[PDB]
């Protein structure tokens, strides 16, 4: 729909920016914006 929640620590983020670099790492898990996804 439009929400990226980690699938690590279950961080909750919405697809609402405008400058994403390619390099976000979850600010909790510290884990790569890989495990990111719809949830």
Do not use: H, N, R
């Amino acid at each position: 729909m439009d929400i990226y929640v980690c699938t690590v620590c279950g961080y909750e983020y919405d697809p609402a920016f405008e400058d994403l670099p390619d390099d976000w790492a979850c600010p909790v898990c510290g884990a790569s914006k890989d495990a990111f996804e719809k949830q």
